[model samples]
Target chain A: SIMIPTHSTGGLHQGTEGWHRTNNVKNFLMRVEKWSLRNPGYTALIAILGWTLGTTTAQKVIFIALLLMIAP
Target chain B: SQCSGIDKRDFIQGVSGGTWVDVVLDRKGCVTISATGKPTIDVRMVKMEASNLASVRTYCLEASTSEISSVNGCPSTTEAHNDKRKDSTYLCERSYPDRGWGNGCGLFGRGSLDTCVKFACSKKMAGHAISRENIVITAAVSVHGHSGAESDDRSQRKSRKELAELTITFKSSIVEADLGDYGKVQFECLMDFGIDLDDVYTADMSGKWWLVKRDWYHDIALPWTAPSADFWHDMDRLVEFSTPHATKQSVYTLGDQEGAMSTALGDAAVIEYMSSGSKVVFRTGFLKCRVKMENLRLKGSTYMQCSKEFSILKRPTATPYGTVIMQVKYAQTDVPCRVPVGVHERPGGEQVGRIITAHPIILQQNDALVIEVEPPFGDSVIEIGLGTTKIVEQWHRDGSSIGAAFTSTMKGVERMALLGEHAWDFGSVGGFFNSMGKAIHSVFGGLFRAVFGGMSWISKVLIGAILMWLGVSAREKTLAMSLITVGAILLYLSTMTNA
Candidate 1:
């Protein structure tokens, strides 16, 4: 039978997905942290992006998306 | 000068006879202590209010301001029984309790327009900034005055000609006409201690004076020119995380340090900043550190990357007092771009200057890693070699910062703290394989399959993307890169033939 009504209907699915996405975003931060100092220009762009968004979940998502989209 | 309806001036006179004894007072009936931590008058407040119960209360996430003022009982008076006024209105005791943040020392009370004063002495703008701007004398002293005064007063004189020096200014008119109102009083205030005393005011015979030189023998001390803790008990340390976020700052304290501090090596627990310009003549209070963000990176893109400057400050394992080597393994995240630099010939690493372990060939007292690596993490499989219970963490590179995932045989606990970032990693080689693997698997599913059996270009493309994702997840570096390369050429040739 299709799964009956469950107390945690879709929470487990959303949580792992969100957590994985958040982890991807954090890895991007790791890249930027490693890249920022070697080249001022590299950090300049990061600083501008971080400066513009300041610090927010939306800003993090944009960075994660940028890395994934250009990954190939 | 009075505080509200109460006469601001309250006097304390020492008992037991002639010229009796006297002292000046601040309008609050409070006496200001000398820079040496002595009250203007030797006498304490006799009849002070004792029921100073603060009705306010605050909980976690903010500091607590409410305290019970039990300023160590009242001073003795000539009318010994009269010093302690049974009056309830006088119940405001000045005992400053060492209250801290309400939330178990966790993060609280920051980023607002001067949040409420939690600890009175902290968040204070208290100091003598009166003279010239350049010669400003400021200090914050703590209680249980360590600068010493109680016994120092005993070594003064044998005949008891020791009269208290009056420094507070009062109107001469009040001194004369109001002198009769007090039952007994005697005092002499000096305007300039530098001027010759005998030549200035002892012209007429006064009530009593200590002129024979033994009483006024102490030298007048100057103001605090350098930053010092002086008499201050303690001060608050505000930590500002210079994170990607450029937006907030908060009132942080030791409570929050223990409460909010972390052991995660890569955790951004290293940070702090002075909120105000109160670098104003400082004292011997706590010295704090903000993260040195600019230097924690690798320039030419190599293996491990970490702080390489003269870092006497922040580190993951550094406790407030000193760098602690609790159960921790220390390593510098670097690659083989340059020859490993350090002492022992094993291709080891050193700090700006590294110290050899006071213990064995392991995590040294200085906390710097001592092992050497000839090639990159080319050690296909991570394995161990030394230490009786030798533990080796063969951490592989993930996306960006995967650190030594601890070890089962961890016995090397003598590393120096300077070159340790708990979580660090070499960049992963997965992206290269993912793209290449896609196109290689593409032709097998599409052109080759359709030419013989079945499978369309559309399904092939979808399969390619799935394979790429799988290769990436598995970290299949070389295979994935080649697949991407061959798939691109095959697609190019097919398009050329169709046209």
Candidate 2:
């Protein structure tokens, strides 16, 4: 299901202008927070590995793998 | 591999170290260095031929430490004391003057001292005395290495692996059949998954693929098969029949032959074939023809008596004979006859023919022929009389009869004239009559004479009066009076005639 938020400018509420701005921030945080919550074990494993390796290359590899798993 | 023949030191130093050098070699072509135990030794070398000074200096320093410093310096009595005190305060201070000696003894002092000592040593060696301007020393260092060769190699290998595993495949179908005398037939199937709408491989035949609604099947040529027949057989036959000049058996007749010929070739061919030199034969239910030329003959003499009374033809003719000849032609032209049973010609009129049977007939003739033959069908006879001057005059005299005869043909013109007549009755006639009266009056009233008479009499009287008045006024002022008299006379004459 697609969730679309709507608003009005002159009639009652200000149109999608204000609503879209709020939704953008809300959706960004919601996406990141939801992903974090869903894969707690994976996230913890990535954090531990990143700390152990302490290299940019290792961090990038872990991040890319996590992205591939989570993205539709 | 490094470039050879050209001095390697010069090539390496010039490109990578930014320096120049000349090397002095012993018999083995290897550089040799000699050093003595001076507190601070400064060495000077001159006129050495080498590619790079930096490489020569590096080699000499390293060789000097292994050979001269170890062997030659060890053999000297001064060297024993110097080597023992090398790490002591005085020796260390003496080695680096900037740190232990007077002011201005850092890099600048060391450089000056080295130059002075090099000069002094050159003079003592009986070599040309070396000045700071002549002696040269060059130092250089180069640091370079590849940064990501391993990562690049790995990525390239991965790319090659992916390319090896990937594959693209396409599938389609083909069909074949024998199309009789037209020879072998091949049907091909094609599908296009266009990269984009505009990327579709369009050709002249692409227009044939239209997205028509199902209901439009009646108008479009759909591949339909009868339930009793095999679908493939029906389809093959249908395709062949639809193609031009195809070798296929069609269940439908090629249409009624007579009807098709008549429509395609027009009425002229129908008339010619059905009636030319023949009496058309009816087989009670079919059409047939049999020649009966012997029975046919031209009939009915038409005389066009000329008239003295002439009327305009309304539409002018190029030649005076054109109007008369056209009317004669119209009247003498043969008339097609459609006859029903049991009708006969009137007794007084000329009889052209007698009917042999009951069928429609057409009589054709050339333009030069004044005589026309009439074909008879059933019991009826048809006649056409020549249009003569006498007949035209008679009709002209009796307007009612002539009008009655042509009422249907001239109805449009007559209707227009009637409308105009009604408009004329509504005060339009008065204006027309007034204009006519004025035109008639102008023609008969002697126009120039009347106009000149009125103007001449008025001008003469006015001129005479002006002269009389001027004569009296001239006694008071002669020149002024004379001028006034001439002006009055000129004005009167100018008013008399426009020109």
Candidate 3:
């Protein structure tokens, strides 16, 4: 919601086949997933914290840092 | 406005000493885990448009038939049974995947729900809905009924209609039907064709499943108790109303569903469904048999489907032969003969009127049978009587619409026979060959005694067919052949009048 689509981020991302922001997030997650695959134990922790427990604090830090990479 | 406020979390405590809690809050943007008898997380999503909500509907949603489901709702199985998905989150036409039929979402949540086990995708999403949001999906996974339990726990609570003790057992055959309304949704009645068991599911096209939704409509019903004589009922005013929005009520057309009625050839065919609940049991009939589960929480944004296999021909029946299980199936028209170009036989002489053997103009069990039956049976001999009497009837039954023509049945099982074992044969080509073979060795050898030295090829063939049929159904080789040399010489007319 903070990255306003209508004007703040240079007009609305209307009619996107797949918008870049979701894609960047998608890619980052895929990278994270690959990292998770390399170490399943950590990926398990990330999913547990990210999807569960009010999107836990450590989960937020990791998620926000990844969002800032390009989604910002 | 609501998006920012929705992110805030709120909590509620259960009023009951038992954990039948009513805790509902902050459900739009954040996860809501009800701290109760078992920890439960509710997941939801909203599509954003211009920073506000665009739509709650998932684009291109449908039912699935595959066991392999995930957080994303798309399933690999029901591709054929389903018509294409609509822009809304549902499948249209007759292709709604069987709702009562679905495997549980084979996923695991991080936190445990039972001892050492956490959340489970016990039930998949089922039929239509609209809603707001809170995004909570616990990451617990298991590949079974309830976390590693590979069987239905019917011992807990079940209806009077026992699961395995089928008093109303039905003999079924694959039947097919075409809906006059829904363009091309055809089906081969499976071994368990009467009942449809599937969950309602939806997903985006990214191959990720979003949700499996099951609300209540066409669910299984049972009595609070085996009926007691209502002691003077209060003017029994139970008026069964037609479905209120009668025209709008559809998971499948009445035509497609009613077509299943023709499949019952036993005491009767009965299929059931779980139309209501957080848990679905193993009794719904019209869907696949292996689909025994409740939570099918597959997630993803790829394909939209309910994931139900459309054609019953995809399944094999456990046909009963003397001792072994002989599996068979009805034909599938949706899966047709795909003859590869190189698979054809090239012309030998490449000239007009040149002789080359081509496939004969005869009906075949089809290439599908080649796969269903084991290899050695590829060259198996089918009994002539069985071919005419049963096989041909089954072929027509598999024609994808309509069923049975009860015209031909062996008559005259009334009068008891004395010795020779003679009866009339309604001649078909194959049966005649068998009859003639018997006649040539037994009847002709004894009665004609070389008088029938000259016989036409077709005369011989016809005799064999007519005589073979009678021999199989009419005559059983008497014990020790009645000492035995005792037999009959039925009259024979030779059409070799020309030859």
The alpha-carbon RMSD values of the candidates against the true structure, listed in the order shown, are 35.9, 56.5, 38.8
Per-candidate clashes come to: 45, 7, 91
Off by over 4 Å in 1: A1-15, A19-21, A24-31, A38-72, B1-281, B284-499
- Candidate 3, residue B306: lDDT: 17
> Per-residue lDDT tens digits of candidate 2, residues B234-351?
1211111121111111121122132222122111101001234322111111001111112111221132222222122222112211111111222223343221212124423454
What lDDT score is found at residue B78 in candidate 3? Answer: 26
Candidate 1 CAPRI classification by DockQ = incorrect
Chain A only: list TM-scores of all candidates: 0.29, 0.43, 0.28
Local accuracy of candidate 3 as per-residue lDDT tens digits, A4-68: 11111111111122343335435645775565457666555655556665443534544533433
* lDDT minimum window of 10 residues, candidate 2 chain B: B55-64
Give RMSD (Å) of candidate 3 vs. truth: 38.8
Q: Model 2, B431: alpha-carbon shift in Å?
A: 81
Q: CA lDDT, every prediction? A: 0.25, 0.23, 0.23
- TM-score per model for chain B alone? 0.12, 0.11, 0.12
Give the lDDT of residue B279 in candidate 3. Answer: 20
Report the candidate with higher DockQ, 1 versus 3: 1
